[PDB]
Amino acid sequence: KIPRGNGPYSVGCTDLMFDHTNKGTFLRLYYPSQDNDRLDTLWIPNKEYFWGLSKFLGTHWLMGNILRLLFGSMTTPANWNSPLRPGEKYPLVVFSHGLGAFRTLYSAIGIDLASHGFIVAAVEHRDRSASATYYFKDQSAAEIGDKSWLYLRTLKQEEETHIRNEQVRQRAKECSQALSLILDIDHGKPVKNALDLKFDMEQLKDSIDREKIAVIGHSFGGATVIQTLSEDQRFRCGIALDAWMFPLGDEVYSRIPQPLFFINSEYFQYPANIIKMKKCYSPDKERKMITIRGSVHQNFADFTFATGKIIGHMLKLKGDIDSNVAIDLSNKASLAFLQKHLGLHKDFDQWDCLIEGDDENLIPGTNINTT
Numbered sequence: 001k002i003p004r005g006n007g008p009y010s011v012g013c014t015d016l017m018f019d020h021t022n023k024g025t026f027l028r029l030y031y032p033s034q035d036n037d038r039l040d041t042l043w044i045p046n047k048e049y050f051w052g053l054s055k056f057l058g059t060h061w062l063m064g065n066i067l068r069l070l071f072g073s074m075t076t077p078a079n080w081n082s083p084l085r086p087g088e089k090y091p092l093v094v095f096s097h098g099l100g101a102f103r104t105l106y107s108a109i110g111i112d113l114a115s116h117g118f119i120v121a122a123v124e125h126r127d128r129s130a131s132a133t134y135y136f137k138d139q140s141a142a143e144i145g146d147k148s149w150l151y152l153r154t155l156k157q158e159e160e161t162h163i164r165n166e167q168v169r170q171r172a173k174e175c176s177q178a179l180s181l182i183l184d185i186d187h188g189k190p191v192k193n194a195l196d197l198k199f200d201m202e203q204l205k206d207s208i209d210r211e212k213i214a215v216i217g218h219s220f221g222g223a224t225v226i227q228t229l230s231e232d233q234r235f236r237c238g239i240a241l242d243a244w245m246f247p248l249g250d251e252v253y254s255r256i257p258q259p260l261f262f263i264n265s266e267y268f269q270y271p272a273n274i275i276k277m278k279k280c281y282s283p284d285k286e287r288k289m290i291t292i293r294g295s296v297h298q299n300f301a302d303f304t305f306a307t308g309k310i311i312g313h314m315l316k317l318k319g320d321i322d323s324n325v326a327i328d329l330s331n332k333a334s335l336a337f338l339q340k341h342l343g344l345h346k347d348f349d350q351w352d353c354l355i356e357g358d359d360e361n362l363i364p365g366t367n368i369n370t371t
Ligand SMILES: O=C1NC2(CCCCC2)C(=O)N1CCOc1ccc(F)cc1
Pocket: 053, 097, 098, 099, 100, 101, 102, 105, 218, 219, 220, 221, 244, 297, 301, 302, 303
């Protein structure tokens, strides 16, 4: 079980694709919901994503049918197509997934944020960093549901620097485009969702607190956060969950005026990556860093909840620390940071001590020694 949000609101979920092309925005929306009596949300909703994960693992595509057999019925505790809870303007998080992931696999984070009163737009990147994604070649294909699938690109070592950088720039552009789409929907522009789902997008009119926008992401998504902030000042702060810094150009490090929070796992990080994080620091800039004790890179994604303790620990999906404990720390510390730097009038300042890593399962800053 992926855990329910800890906040006071029920949580809804839906998909939005606009436009229908491979240059369009594709996202999964998690939002405060009126009702709590809808079907839960199917976690990995098409077989092709499992074929995708199989290539990301470097196994035969038959492993995909086995992954699907194991995980293809699993849901996540968000009310599918529930109407939006009205009568309140919600701040917005745009969320970026890791390499080999896709939009649906950080529901534990997305659901928790929504339950505290955020709308979360988990984008699906079309840069070939996703295990899989899809779109429609033209209008005809969109009307009849004829999907075109795009799979993870495997790189030669000679391509790594250049292509990873092309990808993080495209990721940043997709985050800005998703923000613009949501903002245009907030300002009432009618938008025909390329997916025929029974979530009326007109509900989102005048529901976004338009100043209060943040970007959050895991791994490749943590680089995406940083690139996005340097390019798009509409985002007022960023939170990088166990960021993979390699994709970033040397030019970006001095170019992030917004507050930035690094939440790292204990076992993922290494000097080269910490050094790059520390190139983001300047005395004028607001920077914070914490490390979750006993955590691994996968503690931020939903597969940390999808298997039992023994097999999870074997596959590096779980760490020494409990998965619910770990994600509660990351989510609560994120909430306090967002409250601080978006100027929210909620109670998330109860978790301020977590930003300084003041907790027995936290390390202030980093465990990684440099030079
Ligand atoms: O984005 C990056 N990059 C690296 C790989 C390359 C070296 C650096 C680390 C990594 O593991 N991730 C996070 C991937 O996260 C997930 C989560 C769920 C999932 F189904 C698939 C993937």
